[PDB]
Amino acid sequence: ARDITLLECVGKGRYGEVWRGSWQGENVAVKIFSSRDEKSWFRETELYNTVMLRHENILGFIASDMTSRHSSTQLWLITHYHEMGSLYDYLQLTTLDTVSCLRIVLSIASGLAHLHIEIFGKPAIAHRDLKSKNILVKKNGQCCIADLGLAVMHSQSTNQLDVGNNPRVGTKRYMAPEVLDETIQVDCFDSYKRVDIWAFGLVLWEVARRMVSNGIVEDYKPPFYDVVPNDPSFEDMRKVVCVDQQRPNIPNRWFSDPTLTSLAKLMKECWYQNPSARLTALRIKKTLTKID
Amino acid sequence: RTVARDITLLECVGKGRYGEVWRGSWQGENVAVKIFSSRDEKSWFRETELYNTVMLRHENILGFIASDMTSRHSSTQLWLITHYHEMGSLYDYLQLTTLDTVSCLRIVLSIASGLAHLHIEIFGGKPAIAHRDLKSKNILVKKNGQCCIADLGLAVMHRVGTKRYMAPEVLDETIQVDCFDSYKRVDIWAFGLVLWEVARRMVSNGIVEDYKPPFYDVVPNDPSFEDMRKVVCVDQQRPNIPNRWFSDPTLTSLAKLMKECWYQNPSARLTALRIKKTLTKID
Numbered sequence: 001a002r003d004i005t006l007l008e009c010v011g012k013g014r015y016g017e018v019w020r021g022s023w024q025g026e027n028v029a030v031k032i033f034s035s036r037d038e039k040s041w042f043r044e045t046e047l048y049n050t051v052m053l054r055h056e057n058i059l060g061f062i063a064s065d066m067t068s069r070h071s072s073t074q075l076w077l078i079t080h081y082h083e084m085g086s087l088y089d090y091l092q093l094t095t096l097d098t099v100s101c102l103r104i105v106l107s108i109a110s111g112l113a114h115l116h117i118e119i120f121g122k123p124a125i126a127h128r129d130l131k132s133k134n135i136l137v138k139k140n141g142q143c144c145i146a147d148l149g150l151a152v153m154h155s156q157s158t159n160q161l162d163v164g165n166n167p168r169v170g171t172k173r174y175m176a177p178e179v180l181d182e183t184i185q186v187d188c189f190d191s192y193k194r195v196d197i198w199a200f201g202l203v204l205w206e207v208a209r210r211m212v213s214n215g216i217v218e219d220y221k222p223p224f225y226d227v228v229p230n231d232p233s234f235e236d237m238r239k240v241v242c243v244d245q246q247r248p249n250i251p252n253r254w255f256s257d258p259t260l261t262s263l264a265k266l267m268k269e270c271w272y273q274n275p276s277a278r279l280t281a282l283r284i285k286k287t288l289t290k291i292d
Numbered sequence: 293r294t295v296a297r298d299i300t301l302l303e304c305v306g307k308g309r310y311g312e313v314w315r316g317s318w319q320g321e322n323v324a325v326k327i328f329s330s331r332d333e334k335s336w337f338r339e340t341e342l343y344n345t346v347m348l349r350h351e352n353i354l355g356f357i358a359s360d361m362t363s364r365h366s367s368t369q370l371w372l373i374t375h376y377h378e379m380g381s382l383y384d385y386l387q388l389t390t391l392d393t394v395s396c397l398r399i400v401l402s403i404a405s406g407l408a409h410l411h412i413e414i415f416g417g418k419p420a421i422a423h424r425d426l427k428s429k430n431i432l433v434k435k436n437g438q439c440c441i442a443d444l445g446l447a448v449m450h451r452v453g454t455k456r457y458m459a460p461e462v463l464d465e466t467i468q469v470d471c472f473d474s475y476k477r478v479d480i481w482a483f484g485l486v487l488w489e490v491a492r493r494m495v496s497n498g499i500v501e502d503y504k505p506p507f508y509d510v511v512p513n514d515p516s517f518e519d520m521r522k523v524v525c526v527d528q529q530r531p532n533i534p535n536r537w538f539s540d541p542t543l544t545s546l547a548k549l550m551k552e553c554w555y556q557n558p559s560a561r562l563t564a565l566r567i568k569k570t571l572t573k574i575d
């Protein structure tokens with residue numbers, strides 16, 4: 001029973017479209033890629049070929065298809081469906097308590113450590129576009145990481161399955177200093193893990209703002225909302241991150257709450273300009289497991 | 293909208309180290325479904341990446357329909373779906389069938405047309421493509437008498453090839469691997485062997501040769517790399533041209549053509565475009 005019914009469009013952008021569909025009587029998400037993003041479709045298909053990729057905190061794969069008649073081609077990715085939508089969507093109007101905030105951020109750390117660590121199998125994987133729109137919320141209050149179209153793979157028993165020649169990929173708002181200044185070591189797998197850690201810190205900040213403490217919470221804002229234009233360019237981001245050495249501000253009310261004090265310390269250890277100074281995903285996961 | 297993806301697998305028409313090929317049915321229409329072995333997974337990726345780069349459409353190239361990857365409990369299933377050619381492969385067809393002048397030329401000109409289309413860069417278009425496993429089992433026969441080239445799982449854009457069809461520069465490891473033209477010239481060598489296989493089955497003066505694969509008389513049934521190197525590189529043997537061909541003007545011209553695909557020096561061999569021109573002036 002391979003047939004799918006497309007029921008409603010839940011997203012449209014430069015990436016193509018995502019549809020809620022029905023398959024074997026279950027909701028599925030069907031992404032139809034833009035022509036512009038055909039290399040992402042193939043990269044994501046290469047990533048999902050890994051059976052040991054499967055994890056509670058990684059978006060689960062059902063099928064990938066490239067179809068053509070005559071001169072046009074369609075590119076399909078079919079996954080499990082998360083009706084709560086992205087973490088970006090969820091944070092807009094929901095506030096969090098301590099338990100819900102830690103559950104979300106530990107689940108993302110668990111997914112990211114699963115990607116980064118080689119299994120002897122699954123290669124080590126760096127995501128390269130981590131952000132709150134690429135994280136889905138599950139009904140159990142954990143998240144899963146989505147969109148492996150820019151991912152890079154590495155095997156310690158051999159070598160490295162790397163990028164296109166274009167290093168200006170990833171979402172500009174979440175790009176690490178070394179991506180924005182184009183000094184990143186492109187032949188070094190560890191470089192790409194360190195870019196993910198930078199972006200994880202920004203996602204931690206986005207989530208923590210929405211956790212209530214002492215009857216106070218911040219409104220949802222994207223990273224660097226206060227220092228860059230609404231739709232920031234690559235150069236806008238380079239200016240604030242590389243020239244101005246800006247990092248997201250820690251609201252002072254956080255320092256009255258032990259959880260938010262711990263999270264502020266963790267996100268600062270994701271934001272060093274020196275990529276090798278940043279925490280590992282495993283260390284973040286260990287730290288969040290210990291925080292109450 | 294409904295996306296009908298069900299494909300009914302009706303009969304297995306091929307089994308091998310590569311996996312299986314099935315005749316299937318989608319929406320009342322025959323398709324061919326290649327189900328890849330774990331052994332041959334990289335061929336699915338290479339062909340899929342090529343068709344994602346350039347959607348080839350040519351009467352003498354097997355017609356792409358889809359690349360499918362389906363998650364199973366503990367495995368990934370990889371299918372390539374193409375048009376279906378009920379007459380099967382040229383290899384199959386030549387075992388039983390003899391040819392006349394018109395059929396022989398139509399077959400070999402259609403293969404040369406497919407191969408030149410792969411080899412040529414078209415601007416505005418397609419990258420140049422070398423096949424790297426051209427042989428009579430990777431050519432399908434169509435009802436209109438033309439053939440189409442199949443299996444781009446080893447193709448390169450600008451697993452090893454079948455040993456029996458490897459050019460001398462592949463067997464002696466002197467191939468200039470950093471030069472794309474090298475891979476075109478390896479295909480031309482293999483094309484010459486296919487042209488020999490076909491020409492043997494063309495009747496002249498009531499005479500025809502039995503189907504044999506290239507080098508049948510000088511290598512074992514399943515030849516080693518070394519077996520082939522000794523024949524092709526050390527002794528510099530080439531397939532036999534029977535005397536009876538020299539009584540027939542078509543087979544005389546085809547013998548000259550196949551000799552010009554088999555030079556030891558890869559840069560001396562004819563190009564696919566020159567082979568096409570030569571064939572349009574025979575008969």
Ligand SMILES: COc1cc(-c2cncc(-c3ccc(C4CCN(C)CC4)cc3)c2C)cc(OC)c1OC
Binds near residue numbers: 067321357358
């Ligand atoms: C994969 O293969 C097959 C696919 C199909 C098929 C089924 N539904 C719809 C389509 C289609 C419609 C419209 C557009 C275009 C039209 C112009 N512009 C607006 C862009 C969009 C593209 C595609 C097709 C091609 C049929 C087939 O056979 C009859 C196929 O072959 C097996």
Ligand SMILES: COc1cc(-c2cncc(-c3ccc(C4CCN(C)CC4)cc3)c2C)cc(OC)c1OC
Binds near residue numbers: 010011
């Ligand atoms: C990020 O990337 C991918 C995501 C998905 C995916 C999976 N489940 C659910 C969704 C979703 C559903 C619904 C909403 C709501 C939110 C707000 N409301 C106002 C409108 C709609 C948002 C999101 C998505 C987008 C599938 C993908 O591929 C098939 C993705 O690409 C890899």
Ligand SMILES: COc1cc(-c2cncc(-c3ccc(C4CCN(C)CC4)cc3)c2C)cc(OC)c1OC
Binds near residue numbers: 357
């Ligand atoms: C996913 O998988 C398979 C799909 C199909 C298939 C079945 N029905 C319809 C289609 C179709 C084509 C094109 C469009 C649209 C695209 C955008 N719009 C502006 C124009 C037209 C819609 C739908 C397809 C591609 C067949 C399959 O097997 C033969 C598939 O499995 C490999």
Ligand SMILES: COc1cc(-c2cncc(-c3ccc(C4CCN(C)CC4)cc3)c2C)cc(OC)c1OC
Binds near residue numbers: 305374377378
């Ligand atoms: C070389 O490679 C590929 C080939 C094909 C393919 C396409 N049409 C038809 C065929 C076929 C059909 C029927 C017979 C036999 C069965 C009955 N009788 C005893 C004589 C005839 C043989 C062959 C094939 C094998 C598809 C592929 O992929 C989907 C191939 O791989 C790219």
